[PDB]
Structures are given as C-alpha cells and as structure tokens.
Amino acid sequence: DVQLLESGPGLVAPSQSLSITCTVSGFSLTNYGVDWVRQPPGKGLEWVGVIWSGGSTNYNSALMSRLSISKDNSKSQVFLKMNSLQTDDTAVYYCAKHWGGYYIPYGMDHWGQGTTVTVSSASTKGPSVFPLAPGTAALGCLVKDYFPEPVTVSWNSGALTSGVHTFPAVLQSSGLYSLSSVVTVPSSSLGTQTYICNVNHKPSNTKVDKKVEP
Amino acid sequence: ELVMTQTPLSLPVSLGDQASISCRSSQSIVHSNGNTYLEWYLQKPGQSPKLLIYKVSNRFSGVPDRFSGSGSGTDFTLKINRVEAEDLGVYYCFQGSHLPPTFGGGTKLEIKRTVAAPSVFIFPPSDEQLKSGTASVVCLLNNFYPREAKVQWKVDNALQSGNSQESVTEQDSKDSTYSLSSTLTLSKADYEKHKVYACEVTHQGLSSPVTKSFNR
Numbered sequence: 001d002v003q004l005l006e007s008g009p010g011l012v013a014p015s016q017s018l019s020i021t022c023t024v025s026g027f028s029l030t031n032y033g034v035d036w037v038r039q040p041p042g043k044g045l046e047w048v049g050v051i052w053s054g055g056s057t058n059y060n061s062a063l064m065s066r067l068s069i070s071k072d073n074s075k076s077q078v079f080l081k082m083n084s085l086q087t088d089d090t091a092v093y094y095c096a097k098h099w100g101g102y103y104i105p106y107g108m109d110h111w112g113q114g115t116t117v118t119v120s121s122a123s124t125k126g127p128s129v130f131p132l133a134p135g136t137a138a139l140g141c142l143v144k145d146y147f148p149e150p151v152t153v154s155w156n157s158g159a160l161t162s163g164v165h166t167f168p169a170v171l172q173s174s175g176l177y178s179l180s181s182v183v184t185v186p187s188s189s190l191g192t193q194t195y196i197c198n199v200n201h202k203p204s205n206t207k208v209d210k211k212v213e214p
Numbered sequence: 215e216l217v218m219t220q221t222p223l224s225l226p227v228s229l230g231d232q233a234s235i236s237c238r239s240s241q242s243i244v245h246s247n248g249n250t251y252l253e254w255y256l257q258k259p260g261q262s263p264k265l266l267i268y269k270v271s272n273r274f275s276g277v278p279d280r281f282s283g284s285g286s287g288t289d290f291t292l293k294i295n296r297v298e299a300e301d302l303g304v305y306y307c308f309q310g311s312h313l314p315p316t317f318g319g320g321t322k323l324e325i326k327r328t329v330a331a332p333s334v335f336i337f338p339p340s341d342e343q344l345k346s347g348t349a350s351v352v353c354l355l356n357n358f359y360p361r362e363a364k365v366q367w368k369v370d371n372a373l374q375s376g377n378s379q380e381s382v383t384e385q386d387s388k389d390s391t392y393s394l395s396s397t398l399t400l401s402k403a404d405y406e407k408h409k410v411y412a413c414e415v416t417h418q419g420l421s422s423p424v425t426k427s428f429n430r
C-alpha cells in the first residue's frame with residue numbers, strides 16, 4: 001500500500017527557512033528515488049529537485065543555491081530544506097515516488113497530497129464559521145477571516161459527500177481569506193436529519209463543528 | 215536548459231470529441247541510451263498529478279485506451295479520443311532525458327456540454343455574524359453551463375458596486391457544470407439600515423434574469 005505524505009509549517013516569514021518532511025510508506029527509499037515538485041497558486045507544475053536511491057541529489061536551476069534535499073532510509077523520510085524565502089516561494093509542495101527504469105525513472109508513480117506554504121510576515125488567524133441557513137434545499141457554512149490557506153471542510157464527518165461544493169477561497173482587503181462550502185439536500189430530511197460542517201484549519205490548529213439549522 | 219512548449223493553454227472540447235495536445239522541446243530529448251523520457255500527467259481539480267503516458271507512448275496501468283501519446287525528437291502529441299467528463303483538468307508534459315528535467319506550461323481541458331441553467335439561493339447574514347458587527351449576504355448559483363454568468367446585488371433596489379466578491383468552482387468532473395458564490399459584505403450598521411436584499415442573476419440558460427430576495 002504505497003503512501004507519501006508531506007509535513008510542512010504552513011506559514012513562513014520572508015528571509016527565513018523552510019523544512020518539509022515527506023513520510024513514505026509501502027516502499028523502501030533505499031530502492032527508490034523521490035522527486036520534489038511545486039505549484040505556485042494558479043500557476044503550472046515546477047520540478048524542484050530529486051534524491052536518488054543512493055542518496056545523491058540534483059536541483060532546480062533557479063532554486064539550487066538555496067535548496068537542499070536529504071533523507072533517512074531507516075525512517076522512510078525525505079527532507080526538503082530551503083533558505084532565504086521570498087514571496088515567490090508561496091506554493092504547494094509535493095513529493096513523488098520514482099517508477100520504472102534503471103537510472104532514469106519512467107515516470108512519477110504516486111504523489112503526496114501536497115503541503116501549502118505561504119511566505120508572509122502576517123500572523124496566523126483561525127476562521128470564524130457562520131451557518132448559511134436553509135423539494136431541494138441548500139444550506140452551508142461561511143468560513144471567514146483566516147490566514148493562511150488552506151481550510152478543509154466536510155459535512156457530517158465525511159458521511160455526506162454528494163452535492164457538496166466547497167468554493168475556492170477569496171482574499172479580502174483585510175489580508176484574510178474567506179470561503180463557503182454549501183450542500184444541496186432533500187427538503188423532507190430537514191425535519192429528520194441534522195447537518196454539521198466540520199471546518200479544520202491546521203496552521204492555527206482550530207477545529208470547528210457547526211450545526212446549520214432552518 | 216531545455217524548454218518544453220505546450221499548446222494550447224486552454225482546450226475547450228465537446229463531450230465525445232477528440233482532443234489533441236502538443237508538446238515541443240527546444241532540443242532533442244532522445245537520451246544517449248536511445249530512450250526518450252517524455253511523460254504526460256493529468257492534474258484534476260483538487261487532486262495531485264497523475265501519470266498517464268511514459269516514454270512517449272506507453273500507457274500507465276489503469277489508464278484507458280482513449281489516451282495515446284506519440285511523437286519523437288522534439289515534436290510530441292497527446293490524443294484523447296471520445297473525451298469524457300472525467301478527463302477534465304490540466305495536462306502537463308515532462309522531459310526527463312536532460313538535467314534539469316522540466317514540465318511544459320500545462321494545457322487546461324474544459325468540457326463543452328449542453329446549456330444548464332443555475333438554481334439560485336440567497337442567504338441572509340447569520341444572527342451570530344450580526345452579533346459581532348459584520349453582515350455577509352451570500353448568493354449561490356448552483357450547477358450551470360457555460361461559465362459566463364452575471365450576478366448583481368440590489369439593496370432596496372439600489373444596484374450595489376465595489377462591495378462584493380465572487381468565487382467559482384472548477385468544472386464538475388461528473389457533469390461538467392460550474393457553481394458560483396457571490397458574497398455581499400456590509401457593516402451591521404449599514405445592513406440594519408435597509409429592508410430588501412436581492413440577488414439578480416443572468417445566464418444563457420435562463421429565459422430572463424432570475425431574482426432571489428428577502429426582507430431583513
């Protein structure tokens with residue numbers, strides 16, 4: 001069961017350092033190269049660097065003077081470190097496992113979910129969550145005034161998936177983000193069933209459950 | 215330093231039609247060992263990149279036959295026969311013959327389906343929000359096609375400007391529709407100063423503009 005999972009700090013101030021850990025599972029890093037790839041908001045995929053099975057590395061032209069990738073085979077972990085962070089460096093960072101080939105991989109097999117890194121001198125703010133009150137009913141949650149991205153939103157602890165729309169965040173004149181998640185439900189179940197949105201904001205460690213009522 | 219040039223940037227395609235994506239490399243990507251290490255990746259909305267094609271034309275396991283890569287030297291092509299709703303996202307080529315490896319710019323596949331009118335809902339500020347000094351009026355346009363849609367706010371019939379924000383979802387992977395939210399933000403004072411709040415919506419699938427409203 002191959003798994004890769006990135007672990008970052010979420011927010012980093014300009015000029016300071018970034019450390020992300022990829023924890024790997026269902027394979028041995030003695031046998032597999034891993035790539036690091038990144039994606040600035042709204043922009044294309046950028047190759048960042050690689051650490052070969054043997055432990056040697058290669059880096060991106062643009063970032064290589066500030067970049068270093070290392071690993072712990074015994075611990076199933078790969079580390080990206082990066083100095084002197086600029087606004088530019090705001091991105092989602094993925095690790096990806098090497099698939100196939102002898103000394104050049106045929107492709108990138110399996111990817112982590114990514115970890116989001118904002119380079120900013122603002123401080124961390126948890127969201128306020130306000131209900132959006134309701135043969136089809138729409139209800140929702142307004143998730144407001146948090147920094148930085150991301151927030152994760154689910155309904156009824158992940159049980160209710162169908163007809164959910166969580167909208168992309170918007171950045172307000174205040175420098176804080178704001179989104180809404182909404183769900184379409186049967187009108188008749190409004191009397192019988194309860195609906196809670198589960199809002200999780202990892203950078204501030206704030207978990208909020210909100211009952212949305214008629 | 216190898217550059218990968220992907221065109222077009224955006225590729226609108228009807229369901230069931232063919233889609234052709236082009237990757238050109240500034241030099242040959244035939245490795246000294248005779249292999250040419252060119253991959254194609256799909257990144258769907260809210261998902262990590264997934265491998266489709268490796269070494270120019272080999273399908274990755276679990277990738278359907280509608281997907282085929284071809285080309286050699288500098289000119290390469292990804293072809294998707296009978297485009298399905300699930301094929302929606304951004305395709306990237308990848309070159310791995312030369313250090314440093316690079317992705318192309320990306321090509322966004324939008325799906326062309328039949329017109330679908332939005333369902334409109336309006337939400338008043340929550341009592342919890344008012345009881346802290348800010349009013350957010352939310353207007354939701356659910357499951358529509360095409361993406362172009364006009365949402366206007368009227369406060370006691372005063373057409374509002376500068377005081378609202380829009381957010382549109384990515385295209386839905388099951389039915390190639392968009393949803394949109396427009397949020398009108400007022401201080402509690404300025405909100406409790408007015409009676410009728412109206413979201414007015416214009417769209418190709420509607421026969422005339424639909425209005426959702428409420429009295430505070």
Ligand SMILES: Nc1nc2ccc(NC(=O)CCCC(=O)O)cc2[nH]1
Nearest residue numbers: 035050105107108310311312313315
């Ligand atoms: N997913 C991938 N990560 C990488 C990293 C590096 C790749 N290619 C090379 O390093 C080319 C080396 C060519 C040579 O043998 O000199 C290829 C590659 N693919």
